[PDB]
Design a protein around this ligand. Sequence first.
Ligand SMILES: [Zn+2]
Ligand SMILES: [Zn+2]
Ligand SMILES: [Zn+2]
Ligand SMILES: [Zn+2]
Lengths: 148, 153, 151, 150
Amino acid sequence: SGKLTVITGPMYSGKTTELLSFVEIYKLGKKKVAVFKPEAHVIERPEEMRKYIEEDTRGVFIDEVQFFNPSLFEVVKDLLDRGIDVFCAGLDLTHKQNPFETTALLLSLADTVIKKKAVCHRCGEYNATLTLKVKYIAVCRDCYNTLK
Amino acid sequence: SGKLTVITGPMYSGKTTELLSFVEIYKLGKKKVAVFKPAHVIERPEEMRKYIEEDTRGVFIDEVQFFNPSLFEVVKDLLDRGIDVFCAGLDLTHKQNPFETTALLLSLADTVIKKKAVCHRCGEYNATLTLKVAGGEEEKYIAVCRDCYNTLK
Amino acid sequence: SGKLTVITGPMYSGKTTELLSFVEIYKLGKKKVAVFKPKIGVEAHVIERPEEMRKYIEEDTRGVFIDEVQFFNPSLFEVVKDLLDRGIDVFCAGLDLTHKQNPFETTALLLSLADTVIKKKAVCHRCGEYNATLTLKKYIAVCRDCYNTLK
Amino acid sequence: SGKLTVITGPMYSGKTTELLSFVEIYKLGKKKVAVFKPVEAHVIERPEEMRKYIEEDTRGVFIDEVQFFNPSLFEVVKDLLDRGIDVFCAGLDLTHKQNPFETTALLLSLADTVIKKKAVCHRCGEYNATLTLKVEKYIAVCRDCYNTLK
Ligand SMILES: [Zn+2]
Ligand SMILES: [Zn+2]
Ligand SMILES: [Zn+2]
Ligand SMILES: [Zn+2]
């Protein structure tokens, strides 16, 4: 079976650079990869991935998954079932601290969860877990609460 | 502020014994804790209020799958008040669908711990799913890897 | 091949309990385990030397659990490796650093071998925060800032 | 105080880019950082040479290929943590004969966080390589493949 890794955290936490880190490890090992965003194939629906996935593909990499429809749950469970490893990067929470549904569903399915931190825009510590509106900023919980 | 740790995985993955690892650290430290299951046995997340005091430094909640998704805001508020929260629950049902309350708390978590069980079928330390099977020997629930889930279920 | 998991942290960081959390999952799963501790599966076999483990391991044994590894001879590194090569999962708990913040060598060597590392924290004795990573001095668990205020 | 993160694994498991990724997060957050090897990056022979490149401003220090530094790096890193500086180190945990690299082992002891990286196994093509093997070239392999090839 393939395994699912989900990388998550606020804006500016290094999510996409983590994602393409694994992309690099797979390419180095000479595994065939397919990379998607909402060199990546820019797609509207999760059902568009099949067209860029070959019999040969052993890794599928997905960026900004919060923006995909939740049907990506089922398409990823299917790739896993076929023995394809899947890596997904996206925001866990909105700027109002509500979950992004597609990331939540993927977090439930994940074999491995990576939570990434950012530098806090207000206090400067490497301890920021949240995204705050106004342009977007990454902040820790305490700073989020004092800023609104 | 408080930080949220979420322990999850399939049945028989040791998630309760794990959250007790955490209760104990706090007791050893002479800290006041409040422990909940669906340890006080409550029905609604809004009932935690009654058992949490001004010097409660840690909140521990088991079987989180069985609570209403309002637990998300209950926990968010505890974190903002500086109280550390530890939650254990199942991530997926025997049909491999997400439990909503667990999925919400994983989005909010500072730290996620994914637990594995022993695969009931192939024997390896690698089971991530729960499956309902015929219960003639010991309907029953078993923990399986994905390969074995697909073979059996 | 077997997998190595190492749990480390200061005193009072719940390392022993985490180790039993792993024993019990093998037990529920009907796997045969062997549990060891050093001379300072329901029995913890108290043994002096890492080479003494072989006498309690049957062809059948699928997981090996070792507590307080800092007190074992560093030969534990080769004995654990052999166990991995024979398809047996090993889980080890111990202190990473002495009360003087020097590495415990055996725990150090096991960390380089580990497939998985779990770093555990205690409640800070001075501080009250869930952030102690160090042991001090009675022994007391403390965060790095309080360790420096106290000594 | 600062916190120590140690990134480890076999060759081609992506340690260097993992470390640089943490550099980028810091640089974007407008923290002053310094990088070292056996935002300015310095090549240094001894760990004690970091001292002259750390300013009162410096909030992150990033150190690569740590298996080649003297074990004295442990106490240099301890001092930096004690002065409020965060430290990220990346280096090989095991040599190609599966003996510990001493310097990494000690930093693993000091670490607050440990990241173990995996490579794709050169022999069986899986994402499960934890070991390095001299074959002269070096390759990454799982334990099972290592023992199959020697
Ligand atoms: Zn802040
Ligand atoms: Zn199985
Ligand atoms: Zn303290
Ligand atoms: Zn292999």
